[PDB]
């Protein structure tokens, strides 16, 4: 199934910086564009690519952390949900 979401302003800015062109998204779309953003800006550690450094990026201002691990599935979703409204 799908869950529809409306990003808050900073998330919306990020999404649009990587090609997104709308106000309402599916969660699958949000997660795609965030992955695209991180990959495009090479925010991850070159050697241990589960580690994302974002203290000097907009993503750090969005998530409110200097870094995180891609393996923290719960915390990533929590940090994304804080920046959107469901439906």
């Amino acid at each position: 199934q799908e869950t529809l979401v409306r990003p808050k302003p900073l998330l919306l800015k990020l999404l649009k910086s990587v090609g997104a062109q709308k106000d309402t998204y599916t969660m699958k779309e949000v997660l795609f564009y965030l992955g695209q953003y991180i990959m495009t800006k090479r925010l991850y550690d070159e050697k241990q690519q589960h580690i994302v450094y974002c203290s000097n990026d907009l993503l750090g201002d969005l998530f409110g952390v200097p870094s995180f691990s891609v393996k923290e599935h719960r915390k990533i979703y929590t940090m994304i949900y804080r920046n959107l409204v469901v439906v």
């Binding site: 699958k28 997660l31 795609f32 992955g35 991180i38 990959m39 991850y44 690519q49 589960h50 994302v52 891609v70 393996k71 599935h73 990533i76």
Partner: peptide, 13 residues
């Protein structure tokens, strides 16, 4: 592993 595959594993719950 590549960031690409790790994030896909994330998306692919």
């Amino acid at each position: 592993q590549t960031f690409x595959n790790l994030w896909r594993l994330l998306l692919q719950n």
